């Protein structure tokens, strides 16, 4: 699975780690994260993220 970065603040979503404090368990692909989730650091929505390639 691919890493995704927040293009506003630089937070990296790592699917191996998830974001468990906000209910995103380890092993969750970015596409499967609920669409109301926001960047844990800067608070922007998923639409400001992009695949790290
Ligand atoms: Co951010």
Curated annotation (Swiss-Prot):
GO BP field: alkane catabolic process
Domain (Rubredoxin-like): residue spans on this chain: 1-53
Family the UniProt entry places it in: Belongs to the rubredoxin family.
Cofactor note: Binds 1 Fe(3+) ion per subunit.
Chain sites annotated for binding Fe cation: 6, 9, 39, 42
Stated name of the protein: Rubredoxin
Annotated function: Rubredoxin is a small nonheme, iron protein lacking acid-labile sulfide. Its single Fe, chelated to 4 Cys, functions as an electron acceptor and may also stabilize the conformation of the molecule.
InterPro entries found in the cross-reference section: Rubredoxin, Rubredoxin-like_dom, Rubredoxin_dom, Rubredoxin_ET, Rubredoxin_Fe_BS
Keywords: Electron transport, Formylation, Iron, Metal-binding, Transport
Cofactor field: Fe(3+)
Modified residues (N-formylmethionine): 1
Domain of life: Bacteria
Molecular function (Gene Ontology), one example: iron ion binding
């Amino acid at each position: 699975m691919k890493k995704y970065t927040c293009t506003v603040c630089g937070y990296i979503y790592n699917p191996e780690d998830g974001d468990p404090d906000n209910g995103v368990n380890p092993g969750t692909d970015f596409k499967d994260i609920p669409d109301d989730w926001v960047c844990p650091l800067c608070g922007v929505g998923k639409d400001q993220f992009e695949e790290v390639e």
